[model samples]
Target: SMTSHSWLCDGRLLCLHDPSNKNNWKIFRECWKQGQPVLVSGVHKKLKSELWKPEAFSQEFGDQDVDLVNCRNCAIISDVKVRDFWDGFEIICKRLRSEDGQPMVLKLKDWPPGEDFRDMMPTRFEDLMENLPLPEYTKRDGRLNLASRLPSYFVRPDLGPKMYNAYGLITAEDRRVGTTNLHLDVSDAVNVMVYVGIPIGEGAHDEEVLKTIDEGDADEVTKERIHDHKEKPGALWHIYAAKDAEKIRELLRKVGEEQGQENPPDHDPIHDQSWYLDQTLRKRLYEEYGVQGWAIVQFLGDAVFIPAGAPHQVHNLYSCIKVAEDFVSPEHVKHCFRLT
Candidate 1:
C-alpha cells in the first residue's frame, strides 16, 4: 500500500458534508479538543455569493498590486496585478502539466496587504463575515472566539479576517512544487474554502457528474456524490500538537545541524518558515519523536479549524480561494500570552 507521501492522507480526512447539520459543531469540538483539524464542507453553496470568486476580484482590483509568491522556493516574485496573474493562469497551469514542463508554482495567500480585506473588498467582507455557515465556535463576533471580545486597544495586534487566493495546485513531482513552510499562528482559526480548484486533470472532466446535476430528481446521495466529485482537495495540510512543540523543535534542530544549517533562528524555530517538512523529514519525525501529525485533505467549500499554537503547513494542489479569521479560545489562551 506504500505510495507517494502526497497521497498518504487521501481518504483519511475527518470531514462533514454539510455545515448546517445541528450536530456539526459538536463533532468539530471533539476533534478540536485533541488539537486536530476538522474539514467542514458545503460552505460554498451556503455562501450564496459570487463576490468570493476570482472574476469578482478581477473586476474590483484589476489594477491593484497583489504580491506574487514563488511557492516552492517560498518567497515573493515580481510584483504583479490581479488581472495579470489570473488572466495568465490558464497557460501557466497548462505548462505545469506538460511533459517537459517547468516548475513555476505561484501563490497569492495575501492579496491586499496594507489594510484589512474588509476595507478593500467591502461587499465580500460583509458577505463572508455575515453568512459563512461555520460552527458557532469559530465566529469572529461570537463569545467563544476572543478576538471580538477584546478591547479597542487590542487592535494593535490586528489578528485578521484575511483572505487567501492561490493556485493551491503544487506540481507534486516526481516534481518540486513549493509550499508555505511550517509555522504557527497565535490564535485559533477557521479558514473557509470559498472556491477550490482540484488537482489538474481530475474532477473537472466528470461528464457523468454534469449529467447528474442536470437531472432534476437525482437522489440526495447522488447529489452529494456529484458535489464530492467536483470538489476534490485543493490542498494538503499537516498539523502538529502544541505539547509536541518541543519535540518538533528537537527534530528540527537536529536535522538542521546535520544538514549544515548550524545556526538556528534567534527566537523560536517555528517562527522560521524556511523549513517545510517533506516525506523524508516526516518519516524521521515519526520514528525519532513518535509524533503523529493530523493529516488533512482540505476540499472546496470546506472550513478547516486550526487550533492555537499548533505547528502547521499547507501544500496547495490546484487553484483556489480561501479566507481565514483568527480568535482566541479559552482552552489555549495561554499561548496567546506567551506568543505576545
Candidate 2:
C-alpha cells in the first residue's frame, strides 16, 4: 500500500474544470505567461485510472525487443537503510551479464519506428492530447499540437521523427539513482509527466522547502539541517529560470576549468556541450539569484507540466514508473526560437 502526501506547502495546484472550460484556459495562459510552474488537476481521468500503472507497462512491453527498450541500473548504497514509514516493498532491477564481465540491468522507453510491441505508444499519445487543455495558440500551425502529431520516436539521427519529441518510461531500480544529471533540452518545450506507481514523499512534493533553501530564506544552520531531509524518494524535479542562462553558463565554465585542473591529465574527455552543474554550483545559483526553483513530486495519477527552457533535473525517491512526453507550444515559441 502507498501513503498520500499533502500539497499545502508545495507549489500552487490548479483545480481545473472540464478541458473545454474557458476559465481553465485563462488559468493556463496566466501560468505560462508568467513562466511559473503549475500543477494541473481534473484532466486525463480515464488515462490516469487505466494506463497510469506499473502493471499496465509490464503487461504492454515486458517481452519486447532489447534494442527497443533502454535500461540503466544503479548500485544501492549499503549504508542507506529503508525508512520505517516505507511499505518495505522493494523492486530491484534484474541484473544481467555485461560485455565487460560486469552485471547490468535493463530498462525500457517505448518509442516508435520499430516493429516491436509498440501499440501502446499511439494510445498514450492520443490520450495525452485529448486530456491536455491548451489555448488556441498551442493548437495553431507549427505549434505544440502540430509538433505532437509527429511520429513518436527518440531524438536520434536514425530515428524517423527527427525532432524534440518522444515518450519515456522508467521502472524501479532502473535509472532510479538520480533522475538525471542537470541539463537542458534542445528547444523550449512542455513536459507532460504522469506518475503511475506509488505515492511521492512529502519532501519531494514541497516547493516551500526548496524555496526556503534556494532563496536563503532560512538561516545557514537551518538550511544545512534540512539538506538531507529534502532528499526523499520519488522523482524530485527542479527547474531554474531561463533569463539567467548567460550567468549560469559563465559560472559553469569557471567550475569546469577549476575541475579540469584538479583532475588527472587522462581524465574523462571533455566536450563543449551543455553544462552539468554540480551540487555546489546549484546551491550558488539559488542563493545568488534568489531563484525559488520549482519542485514536483509526481504522485500516482498526476500529470505535471514543465514550461519551456526551464533548466531541470530529477531525483527518483524510489523504484517507481513514470511516462513523459515533450512538445513546443506557441506560448513559448519566442523563447524556443531565441534559444535556437
Candidate 3:
C-alpha cells in the first residue's frame, strides 16, 4: 500500500468523490475518528444519498421512462424537450451483479454549472424527478444496499469536446500490482485520458497540480497537476476529455513549446487501448492485472463524449477524474455510467 500525499488531497482527488464526507455526522464522528481517510463510496450512508437516479433519464426524455436497474442496455425512453439547462448534467449510480442479476441505482449528478447538483436538496431533486419513476431506487432498501457494496465507484457528465456524452469511473485497488493489460476504448471521436496518482499522508501532496503557468519545470508542473503525482501506492485516477480541432491545436502548441519541438505528431486515435502504443520490450502494464469496475470518482470536470463505446480505464498508480465543459445535449440521451 502507498501513502496518500497532500497535494493529491488538495488537487481534489482524495476527497473529490464526496468532499462533504468530512462533514458527515457519522463519517466525521465514526469513520475519520479511526484515523483513516473515510471511503465515501456508495456503501457509506452519507455517500449513498448521492447515487444517480433512474428517473432522471425519464425526465430527460420527457416521454416514457425506463428503470436503470431493470433495463439491460436500454436507453432513456422519453420525448422530453431538450433544453440548454440540461447541458453538462451527469447521472451516476452503483452497478451490482447479484443472484437475481445485475442491478443499478442512481447516486448523484454533476449538476449543470451554477445549478444545484446535490440530491438531498428538495428543489433540485424535484426538478430532476419531474418525469422520473415514482418509487425511486434510493427509497428501496435491497437495491440501496447494492449501491453501498460498491466500495469504489463514481460517475459524471462528460464535459470534453463532445458535450453530450457521459463519463465513467475512476478507481484504485491494491490487488492490481505489477500487472499489465491492454485497455481498448472504441470511440467515434478523439478522446483524451488523464491519469492522476496522489501520495497519501504527510509530505505527499504536490504544490504544482494546478500551477501549470510556471515555466521552469513545465513537465514536472504538468505531471503533478495533470498526471497524478501522489505518494500513495495503487493510487489512481482518470479523466476523459474530448478534443476538437481548435482544442487540438492548442494542445499542439503546448507540446511543441514544452518539448522544444517545432512540430508534433497528430492527436491519437479514438478507438484504441492504453498499452497498444507502447512497443517497449517490457510487458505492457495494464494487460497483466485485472481492472476493478464500479470505480470511485471525485471532482467531475467539464466536457462530454459522443455516442461511442470505448474500452478504457485508468492506469496503475493513478486515480482518474472526468472533466468536461457541458453535460446536457441531445446527443447524450443515453447518458449512463457502468463498470465492466
Candidate 4:
C-alpha cells in the first residue's frame, strides 16, 4: 500500500511504509532510468538522533573544532543579494571569515581521519548491507559485494575507520541559508543530508520558497528575521536530469552575454566549476524547463538520495545546520564512469 512518501510520476502521490521491500529497489531503478528523483524514507533514524545534530557535533568535538580552517574548509560568504560570479569566487579563494558579518556556508571537505565521523555518517556501504543483502548469483561465485567495492574512506589501515575524504557542511542560521550556485558532482554520488538545528516553518511550494528568497518579500518590514539577525527564512532543493547538462551550460553562457562581459571570470576553485549556473540563469531555466526538474523541502530526520549525474542545489529556508556525504554505487557506476 502507498504511504505518505510516494508520488506518481506525473500526477497524484503515494507512499510505502516498508522501505525494505525489494520492490523499492525495482522502483528506484525505474526512476533512475528516467533520471527522476525518488524519496526513500526511514533510512537513518539512529544516526539522525545520535550524531547528526549540530549541537551533538559541538558536544563531541568542542566548539573550536567546528571552525572552517580545521577541516580544510571551503566557505562562501557574501553580502550581495544577487552575487556576481567573480565576487563569489573571490570570497571563496580568500577563505576569509565572513567579512560581511553574515553566517557563512562552510564545507569541510576533509575532517580528521578516524572512526568517530564515519560512525556518524550514513555511508552507502553500511546502508546496503542493512537494507539489501547480497543476491544469490553473487554469493555463488563469492563475488565482491557491491557495497564492499565502495569502502568508507574514513576507515584507516592502522587506526581503523579514520576519516579520509568524508565531507561535512555547516550552514549557519544567522547568515544566508543556501549554496552559492547550481552545479553537478564529478561522479555519480548518493548524498545523505542530515538536517540539524531549529525546525523552520514550511509553506508554499519549493519553487515559491526559492522565489520568495531570490526576489525578496513584498513587505520587507513585516518579514520575519532570526532574533537579532537580518537574514531571511525559507528552504528549497532543486535537481535537474543529467541529460540537461548541455542546456544548463547554454543558460550560463546566455547570462554572461547579458552582462556584456567578454568572458565570465574563473569560478572559485574551491567549488568545482565544470558547470556553475548563477541565479539569473537558474531562474530562466526553471521558467522555461521547470517541468524537467524535481525539487524537495527536507525536514529534520530526512536523508535525501541524489543519484549520480544529477545536477542539484540546496536553498535554506532559515538559518539551519546540515551534514552531507557522497558515495558512488554499483547501480550507477557506469553513469559515474562515463561522466567523469
lDDT of each: 0.63, 0.42, 0.26, 0.40
- Tell me the spans in candidate 4 whose CA falls farther than 4 Å from its real position: 1-5, 8-17, 44-48, 63-116, 119-177, 199-235, 264-280, 286-291, 319-331, 338-340
RMSD of each: 8.1, 10.0, 19.1, 10.6
Per-residue lDDT for 125-243 in model 4, tens only? 35332432112211212242132353343221121122211112233221233342466664433333344232222222234443444342122221232224433332346677777
- Candidate 3 lDDT tens digits, 201-311: 222324422221121112232244335643222222222222122332343345446757654455433222212111121122223322211121222121112222323
In model 1, the runs with Cα more than 4 Å from the true position are 1-14, 91-103, 133-135, 150-159, 168-178, 198-230, 264-267
Highest TM-score among the candidates is held by which one?
1
* lDDT score at residue 249, model 3, on the 0-100 scale: 35
Per-residue lDDT over 1-340 for candidate 1, one digit per residue giving the tens place of the 0 to 100 score: 4211111133333566666676665555655676666666677777755676666677777897766776655556666666866653434544232234554557764666745676777777777776554446666667666666655433322645787766644323412233567888767888887876443434353443233223212234424534666545555667888788788888888877888876745446778776777777777898988987865656677787788888987766566677887767766676767334
Weakest ten-residue segment in model 2 by summed lDDT = 157-166
| Model 3 TM-score, 2 decimals | 0.22
Q: How far does residue 67 in candidate 4 sit from its true spot (Å)?
A: 5.2
Assess every candidate by TM-score: 0.78, 0.58, 0.22, 0.56
Question: Over 4 Å off in model 3, which ranges?
Answer: 1-44, 47-51, 60-340
- Model 1 whole-model lDDT (C-alpha atoms): 0.63
Clashes of 2: 5
lDDT measured at residue 145 in model 2 versus the true structure, 0 to 100: 41
lDDT of 2: 0.42
Ranking by lDDT: 1, 2, 4, 3
Model 1 / residue 233 / CA error / Å = 1.7
